[PDB]
Amino acid sequence: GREVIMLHVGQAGIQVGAMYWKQICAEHNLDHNGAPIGGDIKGDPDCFFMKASGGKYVPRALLIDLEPKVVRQVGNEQLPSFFDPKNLIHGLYGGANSFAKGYLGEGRDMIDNIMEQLKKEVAKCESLQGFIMTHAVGGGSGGGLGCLIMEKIKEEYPKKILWSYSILPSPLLSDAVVEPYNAILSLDKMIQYTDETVVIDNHALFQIVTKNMGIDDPIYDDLNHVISQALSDITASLRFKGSLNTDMKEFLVNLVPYPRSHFLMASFAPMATAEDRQYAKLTTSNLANALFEENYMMAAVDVTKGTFLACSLLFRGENTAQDITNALLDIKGRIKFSSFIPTGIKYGMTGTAPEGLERSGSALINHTGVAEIFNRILAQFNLMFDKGAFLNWYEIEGMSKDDFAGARDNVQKLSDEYKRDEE
Amino acid sequence: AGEIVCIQVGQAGNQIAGAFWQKICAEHGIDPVNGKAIDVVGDTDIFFNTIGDKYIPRAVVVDLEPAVVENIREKFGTLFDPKSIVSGADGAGNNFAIGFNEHGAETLEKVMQVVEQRVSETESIGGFILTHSCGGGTGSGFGSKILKTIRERYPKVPIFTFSIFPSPKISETVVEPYNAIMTLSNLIKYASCSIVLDNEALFSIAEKKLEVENPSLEDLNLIIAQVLTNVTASLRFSGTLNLDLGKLVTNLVPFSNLHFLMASTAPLVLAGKESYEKMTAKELSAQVFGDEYICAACKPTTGRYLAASVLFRGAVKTSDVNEAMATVKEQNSFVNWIPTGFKISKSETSPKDSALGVIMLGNNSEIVSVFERIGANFDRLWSRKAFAHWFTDSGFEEKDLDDARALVQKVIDDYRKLTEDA
Ligand SMILES: Nc1nc2c(ncn2[C@@H]2O[C@H](COP(=O)(O)OP(=O)(O)OP(=O)(O)O)[C@@H](O)[C@H]2O)c(=O)[nH]1
Ligand SMILES: Nc1nc2c(ncn2[C@@H]2O[C@H](COP(=O)(O)OP(=O)(O)O)[C@@H](O)[C@H]2O)c(=O)[nH]1
């Protein structure tokens, strides 16, 4: 089957997914208006779409939210008639930026409908490869339903691979003051439930939008681009004849040696975004290196100083296999891997491309500097918790102080596990 | 869904609400009183019930004394659906106990029946907002009974209030402080949050910045309405942060019982529309965070912010906001250094009468001086002697009056303990 089901949870999740779906359709020559096809189909629809005999390619995804808003905007206005209505699942009240509400309160009833509807979708799949969930890490419902759903997925689908893509809050971009705690709870459960996750830091993206893209007054409408753009590239291998990680399982083999340390950084280029982006170079002598430059790091971590545990470097389009092979010669040695693993950057390419680009690429990097992301979040959390700020918004729903402590411990352990690999 | 039911109690409530709903309608494009609307913009259904070539405020009016029902029936006009006006057989003097303890029981049943109607007509309740003064026989008497009975029915629905605290402006050596403390107690016990509007503060602002020699109480209300509309507007003209009423509650109040908020706005609009200022973010912030513009008369410039947020209404450049904010953070620090405690949001819908509205809300430790003033008045009339005029038949035992004082002292002590600047 090789089928993948996406679960878009909460506002960030559904909004980014909406953009993802618009772009995947373009790649496959599908019309946003219910995904009929403009003639022949390019790419492999078997991964993300139900191939209706009627010519309707049904995106296989759920749109899940506690607030009956983003689901209606997308179902009725942005991708009207694209997503199948039975898969638009929503509650009545949102959470007030509180994980506890998203996880312990609203949603406890809804989860049976979420999982039943997921079952219905899974049931018509020939065979799943896995699930991909998208959400804000620290979102009330994002971390809330997101984590609750993940738990139930692991119980119902014990042998399928669970991936997630999620967005971290930052000092400048955040709609909540209690994030940092929603975030460690969210992270904790993911450590316990996911097989692999890609984490994007809105801090990074800002910085990129602000200085590398040249866009002042940054807004979420642009940030969501760069997120969806990276996502459509990362998941691209699953849509085409190619090599390397052509299956979620192969990704796990290559990207997560040892347990728990499965937090990957996203690297993506070019950021054409919407600028004319005329390109006098696009040369592979730059692109291959660009994917190891801070300018394209959606994690806000310098890969220069740290130890790689894994790296999968994917190129697309017109790039010469030999030129890339030669390009890596000047990367290896700036990039170092742990002495306890098989080493080297694994790379390859698929000769297809998104509209507007002859050549492009991305990388999934697992390296010890991910610890710094966690360190920032934990520091904020530790201060919040120790003096009791905002505890009541959690305690009121039953989110005990003991769960705060539990998440504190597990997330701290991740950091410790990565730090010890530095030398 | 995420809709708001507003409950308007007592004459002070009616007078503020009148100004409020007229201004809000104008901002959305809806003809106040009557005239339907024209090309309505903004998330109208949060506050209005669209009927069909008609919109009404999703609101409840409580007039214990029947003598004032015409202030809504005729003066507010046909804008507020008259079936939502609830009134009693008689009124109350300015004795909290009359409005609060076993009085108007039949009226109260009807009050809640009407609240329930506005709720059943709403897909989901994003919260409730109450508007009342704190010293009134109905205003806080019923206002407090209503606050409590609402929570009993809707324990998970936040109630936000905008309450007006009295000031004995002309030698009012009366029992009112008794009303004020008893309602303060109930606000602590049952509200999720509230804005503290102190008439004395506002008086000084009208006198000093609006240049009004002797504002009538009804003119003061214009400043109040300006604040109320611009604060409320964060939820109707969508901006850069995805806010709701429940979310505002989470972000501005880190502890139970420390939910009393200050409010400040700029530019103030002169009632006569006599002049306009250059709408510079820096200038606007300078006014908003100045002591001179604070509705609490507390001088927050000497305190510490437990939580805070700022909304800019209209088109302002990010590049100017950031410098204005840098100046503010250099002057007013935050409690426990919570790095996430200060939020800024923007939306393009400018207010009528200016290019930019700037609204600040915050939870600041100098707010205690409001409650300390109430306590002092209470003590002088209570610990010195039992001044209260035998409020015992449907009244309070000394212990109940002492309970209120005790709760108030606790809230004062807690703000003082959080901000010891160590
Ligand atoms: N990826 C992403 N992050 C966003 C977006 N908008 C805001 N954020 C960030 O996500 C953080 C978590 O809050 P949100 O993601 O808005 O939360 P939510 O998904 O709305 O969750 P609910 O409020 O429960 O519906 C915010 O504080 C911002 O830092 C967006 O469009 N995409
Ligand atoms: N700011 C403001 N305060 C008011 C207004 N009306 C009354 N008050 C205050 O409310 C108290 C009197 O209560 P009121 O609501 O008028 O009477 P009630 O309906 O019998 O409770 C006094 O402390 C007044 O200063 C008003 O329109 N604006």
Residue B420 sits at the chain A interface (C-beta within 8 Å):
no
Report the residue among B133, B178, B219 best suited for mutation to probe ligand 2: largest number of ligand atoms under 8 A from its CB: B133
Report the residue among B144, B164, B169, B178 best suited for mutation to probe ligand 2: largest number of ligand atoms under 8 A from its CB: B164
Q: Is A250 a catalytic residue?
A: yes
Task: Mark which residues 307-336 of A lie under 8 Å from B by CB.
Answer: none
A81: left (phi over 0), alpha (psi -120 to 50) or beta: left
Question: For residue A144, which ligand has an atom nearest its CA?
Answer: 1
B229 and B24 Cβ atoms separated by less than 8 Å: yes
Closest partner residue to A177 among B156, B256, B343, by Cβ? B343
Q: Is the dihedral of CA A80, A86, A88, A91 positive or negative?
A: positive
The verdict on the CB of residue A222 being under 6 Å from ligand 1 is no
Taking the CA atoms of residue B271, residue B296, residue B359 and residue A385 in that order, the dihedral angle to the nearest 10 degrees is: -170
- Helix (DSSP H) and strand (DSSP E) numbers for chain B: 13, 12
The DSSP H or E segment spanning A388 is none
Neighbours of A242 (CB within 10 A): 17
Q: How far is CA A341 from the centre of its chain?
A: 26
Closest partner residue to B256 among A171, A384, A392, by Cβ? A392
Atom of ligand 2 at shortest range from CA of B68: 19
SS3 category, A136: strand
Atom of ligand 1 at shortest range from CA of A169: 29
Task: Tell me how far apart the alpha carbons of residues B156 and B94 are, in angstroms, rounded to a whole number.
Answer: 32
Residues of chain B in contact with residue A219, where contact means CB-CB under 8 angstroms, are 240
Nearest of A199, A136, A140 to residue A169 by alpha carbon = A136
Residues of chain B in contact with residue A92, where contact means CB-CB under 8 angstroms, are 1, 123-124
CB contact under 8 A, A98 and B250: yes
The verdict on the CB of residue B9 being under 6 Å from ligand 2 is no
Report the residue among B11, B146, B174 best suited for mutation to probe ligand 2: largest number of ligand atoms under 8 A from its CB: B11
Residue B322 sits at the chain A interface (C-beta within 8 Å):
no
Nearest of A227, A232, A91, A203 to residue A148 by alpha carbon = A91
Nearest of B26, B249, B302 to residue B127 by alpha carbon = B249
Residues of chain A in contact with residue B343, where contact means CB-CB under 8 angstroms, are 174-175, 177
A114 and A89 Cβ atoms separated by less than 8 Å: yes
Q: Which residue has the tokens 């209706």?
A: A52
Nearest of B257, B272, B139 to residue B199 by alpha carbon = B139
User: Which residue minimizes the CA distance to atom 13 of ligand 1?
Assistant: A139
Q: What are the strands, taking DSSP E only, across B1-137?
A: 3-9, 48-50, 55-57, 59-63, 85-87, 125-133
The verdict on the CB of residue A67 being under 6 Å from ligand 1 is yes
Nearest CA in chain B to A70: B242
Angle value at C-alpha A340, between A338 and A345, nearest 5 degrees: 45
Is residue A270 reached through a cis peptide bond, with omega within 30 degrees of 0 on the bond before it? yes
Tell me the sheet residues that pair with A335.
A332
Please tell us whether the domain made up of A3-194 is placed in CATH 1.10.287.130. Answer: no
Q: Which residue has the tokens 């753009």?
A: A229
Nearest CA in chain A to B240: A219
Counted residue by residue, chain B has a size of 422
B143 and B100 Cβ atoms separated by less than 8 Å: no
Cβ-based neighbours of B166, under 8 Å, separated by 6 or more: B133, B134, B135, B172, B176, B179, B180, B199
CB contact under 8 A, A171 and B250: no
Q: What are the strands, taking DSSP E only, across A146-283?
A: 161-168, 196-201, 263-269
Please tell us whether the domain made up of A202-367 is placed in CATH 1.10.357.10. Answer: no
Closest partner residue to B318 among A11, A93, A216, by Cβ? A216
Backbone angles phi, psi at A353, to 5 degrees: -160, 155
Cβ-based neighbours of A366, under 8 Å, separated by 6 or more: A255, A256, A261, A262, A263, A264, A265, A308, A309, A310, A311
Residue A55 sits at the chain B interface (C-beta within 8 Å):
no
Instruction: Label the pairing between strands B342-347 and B357-364.
Output: unpaired
Residues A354-372: b if buried by 16+ CB within 10 A, e if exposed: beebebbbbbbbbbbbbbb
Task: Tell me how far apart the alpha carbons of residues A94 and A102 are, in angstroms, rounded to a whole number.
Answer: 8
Quick one: DSSP state of residue A126?
Answer: S
SS3 category, A279: coil
Neighbours of B158 (CB within 10 A): 22
The verdict on the CB of residue A167 being under 6 Å from ligand 1 is yes
Closest partner residue to A177 among B244, B251, B337, by Cβ? B251
Cβ-based neighbours of A154, under 8 Å, separated by 6 or more: A162, A193
The verdict on the CB of residue A417 being under 6 Å from ligand 1 is no
- DSSP structure string for A291-305: TTSGGGBTT---TTS
SS3 category, B258: coil
Same fold yes or no, A3-194 and A202-367: yes
The verdict on the CB of residue A141 being under 6 Å from ligand 1 is yes
Task: Tell me how far apart the alpha carbons of residues B370 and B202 are, in angstroms, rounded to a whole number.
Answer: 13
The verdict on the CB of residue B166 being under 6 Å from ligand 2 is yes
SS3 category, A67: coil
Residues A155-190: b if buried by 16+ CB within 10 A, e if exposed: eebeebbbbbbbbbbbeebbbbbbbbbbbbbbbbbb
Residue A242 vs residues A236, A245, A328, B307: alpha-carbon distances, Å: 10, 9, 20, 53
CB contact under 8 A, A392 and B255: yes
Tell me the sheet residues that pair with A360.
A316
The verdict on the CB of residue B87 being under 6 Å from ligand 2 is no
Task: Tell me how far apart the alpha carbons of residues B228 and A283 are, in angstroms, rounded to a whole number.
Answer: 58
Q: Which residue has the tokens 């019930």?
A: B49
Q: Which residue has the tokens 């997503």?
A: A83
Angle value at C-alpha B55, between B52 and B58, nearest 5 degrees: 125
Atom of ligand 1 at shortest range from CA of A96: 23
Alpha helices in B159-240 (DSSP H): 176-190, 199-208, 217-232
Residues of chain A in contact with residue B336, where contact means CB-CB under 8 angstroms, are 383, 387, 389
- Residue B20 exposure: Cα atoms within 13 Å on the Cβ side: 29
- Residue A302 exposure: Cα atoms within 13 Å on the Cβ side: 3
Task: Tell me how far apart the alpha carbons of residues B34 and B38 are, in angstroms, rounded to a whole number.
Answer: 12
All structural domains of chain B, each given as residue ranges with its CATH number in brackets, are 3-261 (3.40.50.1440), 262-366 (3.30.1330.20), 369-418 (1.10.287.600)
Tell me which long-range contacts B277-282 makes (C-beta under 8 A, separation of at least 24).
B279/B314, B279/B354, B279/B355, B279/B356, B280/B320, B281/B312, B281/B316, B281/B317, B281/B320, B281/B321, B281/B323, B281/B324, B281/B356, B281/B358, B282/B320, B282/B323, B282/B324, B282/B327
Q: Which residue has the tokens 């604070």?
A: B294
Nearest CA in chain A to B307: A177
Distance from CA of B245 to the nearest CA of A (A): 8
Task: Tell me how far apart the alpha carbons of residues A19 and A227 are, in angstroms, rounded to a whole number.
Answer: 9
Backbone angles phi, psi at A301, to 5 degrees: -130, 135
- Count of CB contacts below 8 A, A vs B? 83
CB contact under 8 A, A11 and B242: yes
User: Which residue minimizes the CA distance to atom 14 of ligand 2?
Assistant: B136
Task: Tell me how far apart the alpha carbons of residues B171 and B109 are, in angstroms, rounded to a whole number.
Answer: 37
Q: At what angle do helices B217-232 and B199-208 cross, to 10 degrees?
A: 100
Q: What is the 3-state secondary structure (H, E, C) of B106-164?
A: HHHHHHHHHHHHHHHCCCCEEEEEEEEECCCCCCCHHHHHHHHHHHHHCCCCCEEEEEE
Report the residue among A135, A149, A175, A229 best suited for mutation to probe ligand 1: largest number of ligand atoms under 8 A from its CB: A175
- Identify the active-site residue in A27, A250, A395, A417: A250
Neighbours of A401 (CB within 10 A): 12
Nearest of A104, A92, A100 to residue A67 by alpha carbon = A92
User: Which residue minimizes the CA distance to atom 29 of ligand 1?
Assistant: A174
Q: Taking the domains of chain A in order of start, what are their residue ranges? A: 3-194, 202-367
Residue B243 sits at the chain A interface (C-beta within 8 Å):
yes
Cβ-based neighbours of B10, under 8 Å, separated by 6 or more: B62, B63, B64, B132, B133, B136, B137, B138, B139, B140, B142, B143
Instruction: Label the pairing between strands A49-51 and A57-59.
Output: antiparallel
